[PDB]
Amino acid sequence: DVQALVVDNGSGNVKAGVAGDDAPRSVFPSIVGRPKNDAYVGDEAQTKRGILTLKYPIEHGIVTNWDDMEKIWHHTFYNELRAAPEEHPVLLTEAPLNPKGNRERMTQIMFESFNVPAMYVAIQAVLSLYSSGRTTGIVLDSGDGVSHTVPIYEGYALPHAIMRLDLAGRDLTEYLMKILHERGYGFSTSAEKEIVRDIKEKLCYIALNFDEEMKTSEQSSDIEKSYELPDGNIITVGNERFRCPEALFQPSFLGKEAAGIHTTTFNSIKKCDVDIRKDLYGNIVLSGGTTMYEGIGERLTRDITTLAPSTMKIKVVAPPERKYSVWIGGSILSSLSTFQQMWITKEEYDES
Amino acid sequence: VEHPEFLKAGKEPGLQIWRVEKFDLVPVPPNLYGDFFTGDAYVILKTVQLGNLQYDLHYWLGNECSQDESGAAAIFTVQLDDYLNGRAVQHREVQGFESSTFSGYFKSGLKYKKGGVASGF
Ligand SMILES: Nc1ncnc2c1ncn2[C@@H]1O[C@H](COP(=O)(O)OP(=O)(O)OP(=O)(O)O)[C@@H](O)[C@H]1O
Ligand SMILES: [Ca+2]
Ligand SMILES: [Ca+2]
Ligand SMILES: [Ca+2]
Ligand SMILES: [Cl-]
């Protein structure tokens, strides 16, 4: 009789909790701070930024500082969940196209540092598709550090068709910081960045037609919306509200030559054989925090409809809890009567 | 990956219906076949004798089913297909928009009921 722990590690935040809950009970920043002259994690690291050098162990969805990642996992088990990792099965998530060597390192740490008794590694986008009640579709997962388009057919990702875009929410926060200089604001420090991130989440939206929105917004002050800063000062944001997330569609705004999210989704579908494309176009599922902008579904629908053959039926699905759809999918999967047969046990791992 | 109901799946021509109940796959009483609770999600396996057997898996989502139920119905569909060596064709069926193939499995046609089993969430 044992309940699995579900941990979804992102570039910006970790989501953690117990199988069978409808949402993660723990969400904290994926940050490790160590003295400038042993380590602090998450919210406590930010409250001590003056004393610590802060680092992000996950870059563009890939674990890249293993020592600090181990600190994140220790904090998850001991300080957030108060769970003995050696006494629970664990479901852990990984990015699309995560190298097998990285999964192997993640597994070694879980079995040999934390002594987990059993573990299962799931692909984030696949969990999100399941949380939407689908086995076939294409997931557009846009987080803080990376965006992926992942075609999935009858339950399994098609690896040769997955796209990775390094543009995601943190680039958008930084772009908002940049364009607010037009108005005289000089947000630049790590703490100011977390304020601008909140402005972005509260005030931004995606225009249905960017050129037309620029024109209408210039004709009155109705575009302008206010935001109360921590110091009590008020900031007014205008067309920055939609110019900021427009960079998802026009990465040149950021000085990137990358294709936008609409083109990338189209290209990902085209990599799949023609006989399954209809099911992908009809099941474009949004996932992750950077897909939360008002207007995103309508805009993507227009733009992908333009690109795709006119015989296709384009349907963009925007689940309301999609900020946590990976974690939710993991909670469902690890609750099923069959999960016990999917995991790898420590004894199996240790004997090779 | 097995399960007692997996062991019974697709052994003979016919129609098998399971309801998702608290993260598990529970047989629907045969007297109820064709009636579907709008609050629930179900997995349906149609087995046809060709020499070999042909398999169509449908997962049916009621308009009021909870996220755990629709998610589990999708996952169990994948797992059943895997148990059938991938040879099943999977079909998503939404209340009121089901394929003619799926409706055709029920001589009395598809009908819906208010209610359903409690969410696992
Ligand atoms: N309502 C919102 N509107 C716009 N952006 C949002 C909203 N809510 C959260 N975000 C952005 O979503 C990002 C975090 O999303 P998520 O938690 O999916 O990323 P992650 O899993 O930490 O990162 P990744 O998946 O890139 O490794 C941040 O950039 C955050 O500002
Ligand atoms: Ca993520
Ligand atoms: Ca129900
Ligand atoms: Ca199949
Ligand atoms: Cl077109």
Residue numbers in the entry:
A (entry chain A): 5 to 41, 52 to 366
B (entry chain G): 3 to 52, 55 to 125
Text of the article:
The major substitutions in the D loop of PfActI are Pro42, Glu49, and Phe54 (Gln41, Gly48, and Tyr53 in α-actin). Tyr53 is a conserved phosphoregulation site in canonical actins, whereas the other 2 sites are interesting because of their possible conformational effects. These residues are invisible or only barely visible (in the case of Phe54) in the crystal structures. We therefore measured Pi release rates for the mutants F54Y, P42Q, E49G, and the double mutant P42Q/E49G of PfActI. At high concentration (10 μM), the F54Y mutation reduces the rate of hydrolysis in the Ca state to α-actin levels. The Mg2+- and K+-activation levels of F54Y were similar to the wild type, but the absolute rates were approximately doubled. In the Ca condition, the F54Y mutant behaves similarly to P42Q, whereas the rates in the Mg and MgK conditions were most similar to the E49G mutant. However, whereas P42Q and E49G directly affect the tip of the D loop in the filament, F54Y presents no foreseeable structural changes besides the added H bonds to Lys62 of monomer n and to Tyr170 of monomer n − 2 in the filament. Additionally, the effects of the F54Y mutation on overall rates (but not the activation) show that this mutation has a role beyond post-translational modifications.
